[PDB]
Structure 1
Amino acid sequence: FQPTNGVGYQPYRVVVLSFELLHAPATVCGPKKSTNLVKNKCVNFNFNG
């Protein structure tokens, strides 16, 4: 891995976020989004639980 190598010869850095399906509790996921709130209006709300 020399600096005058090409883009095919220089290393593409690989990470493998592996997924299997075994009897284990869920630990790491991706995030959850949440929209803005309005006030003084009949709206359905969904808080954390």
Structure 2
Amino acid sequence: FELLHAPATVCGPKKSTNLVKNKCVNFNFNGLKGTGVLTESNKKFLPF
């Protein structure tokens, strides 16, 4: 395998921990990094 960075078709397993809500947490969602409290959302996201 080639480790030179390029579009990576094959990737090792990512590791998702359990999700907590209503508590201040550092959070990561597919590379999106933030600090905050997560709560249920009324806003209607589009599927994509």
TM-score range, shorter chain: 0.3 to 0.5
Task: Compare relative contact order (CA 8 Å, sep 6+) and give the higher one, 1 or 2.
Answer: 2
Q: Structure 1 length normalisation: TM-score?
A: 0.42
Q: Which has the larger radius of gyration?
A: 1
Q: Structure 2 length normalisation: TM-score?
A: 0.42
